[PDB]
């Protein structure tokens, strides 16, 4: 017998960011969670996140990545939580040889942003503990960082409960009913209806949009992370090591200084397993794979970090079929709005896309540009059942 003004579906990275942004403007709100976020069963754990604002997925993305930054830097001043640490994040690759080092460059110039350029031994000799080839060019951005996303989405939670919104935990939401004036989620532990819904089921958004007659390729892989104990002398935050995202021929790799003495963390982008979020294996370690291609790059560019491996971690990325995100209402519901195939990118926009999925509920539109994550796009293949 309790009906709210939003209900949202899956309260990880951009639902809970959803749920602050609405408990915030006194809208009454219900977040519904299959797990109690943050937890380790979706694609926000392993303690730190990435924040690039020169963007090398796409220079349209720099202004969500700016407002985003400003809110984090909003919620770092809210709560006791750590949430940025400045490390600035350097991108490299092959002088010529790099889509993604070329529009990083492109987005920085486009937007005026605060950027140093170098090549080569520069780079060495710049921060020990790289060693790049001769013909390896970069764009350093010293103002990008690293979120603690664990923390952020705690953070958000605290704040949005302290501020009446109601988080129903460890509760599946197995279908939907919606009507035009109305939403309605069925859970084991009970049903609940609202005026509006908000869908952010991230790596299930997969399996379960078909109950919204929703039909869009959406395939979650497995990937994998490591802690490596390092020349802490090099690799740490505390001696400036940046965080990094670079290109190299077999791929792209990205990886977080040393905090703390907790070791280098690195991650290869390109490669993981396609998987099912419910039967996949996350266990660090049962594929060769996850090590080996970490110590690959390693042993190569980063030799002082490459020593035991101190903990691993498997995560899970949701890509949509030209990897760029599905941020909009659903095209027979109004009053329905989805947020999905964040394709290993979404993180650090996690905040300002709270921002828009709040305004999306509540006013069927936003002050954002957001038509490159149009649910209607070609490149995207969607249909309805
Ligand atoms: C996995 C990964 C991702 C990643 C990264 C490194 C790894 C190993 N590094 C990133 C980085 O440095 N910078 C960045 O910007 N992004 C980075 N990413 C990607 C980012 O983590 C993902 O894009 C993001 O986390 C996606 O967020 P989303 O909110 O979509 O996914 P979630 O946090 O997993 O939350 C979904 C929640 O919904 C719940 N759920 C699922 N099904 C249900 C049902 N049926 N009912 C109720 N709740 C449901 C989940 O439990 C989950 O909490
Ligand atoms: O989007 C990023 O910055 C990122 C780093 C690792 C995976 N994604
Ligand atoms: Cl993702």
Same mark, same amino acid.
């Given at each position: 017998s309790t009906h709210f003004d939003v209900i949202v579906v899956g309260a990880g990275s951009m639902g809970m960011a959803a749920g602050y942004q609405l408990a915030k403007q006194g809208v009454k709100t219900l977040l519904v969670d299959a797990?109690?976020?943050?937890?380790?069963?979706?694609?926000?754990?392993?303690?730190t996140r990435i924040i690039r604002h020169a963007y090398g997925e796409g220079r349209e993305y720099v202004p969500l990545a700016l407002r985003s930054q400003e809110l984090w830097y909003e919620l770092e001043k809210e709560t006791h939580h750590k949430i940025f640490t400045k490390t600035g994040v350097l991108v490299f690759g092959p002088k010529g040889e790099s889509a993604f080092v070329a529009e990083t460059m492109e987005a920085a110039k486009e937007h005026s942003l605060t950027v140093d350029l170098l090549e080569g031994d520069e780079i060495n000799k710049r921060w020990p503990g790289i060693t790049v080839p001769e013909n390896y060019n970069a764009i350093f951005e010293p103002n990008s960082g690293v979120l603690f996303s664990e923390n952020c989405i705690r953070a958000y939670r605290e704040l949005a409960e302290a501020r009446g919104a109601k988080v129903l935990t460890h509760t599946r939401v197995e279908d939907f009913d919606i009507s035009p004036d109305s939403v309605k989620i069925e859970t084991a532990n009970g049903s609940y209806t609202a005026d509006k819904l908000i869908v952010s089921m991230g790596a299930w958004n997969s399996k379960l949009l078909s109950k919204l007659n929703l039909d869009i390729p959406l395939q979650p892989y497995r990937q994998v992370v490591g802690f490596f104990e390092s020349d802490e002398s090099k690799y740490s935050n505390d001696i400036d090591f940046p965080g990094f995202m670079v290109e190299v021929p077999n791929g792209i790799y990205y990886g977080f200084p040393s905090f703390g003495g907790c070791g280098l963390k690195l991650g290869y982008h390109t490669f993981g397993q396609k998987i099912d979020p419910d039967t996949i &294996? @996350?266990?660090?370690?049962?594929?060769?794979?996850?090590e080996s291609n970490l110590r690959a790059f390693l042993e190569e560019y980063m030799p002082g970090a490459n020593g035991e491996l101190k903990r691993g971690a498997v995560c899970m990325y949701t890509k949509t079929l030209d990897e760029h995100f599905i941020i909009d209402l659903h095209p027979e519901h109004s009053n329905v709005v989805i947020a999905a195939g964040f394709s290993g990118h979404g993180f650090k926009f996690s905040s300002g896309v709270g921002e828009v999925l709040s305004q999306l509920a509540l006013t069927?539109?936003?002050?954002?540009?957001?038509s490159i994550f149009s649910? &209607? @796009?070609?490149?995207?293949?969607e249909s309805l059942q």
């Open positions: 797990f109690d976020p943050p937890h380790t069963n979706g694609s926000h754990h392993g303690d &294996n @996350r266990e660090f370690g049962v594929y060769p794979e996850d069927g539109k936003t002050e954002h540009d957001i649910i &209607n @796009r070609p490149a995207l293949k």
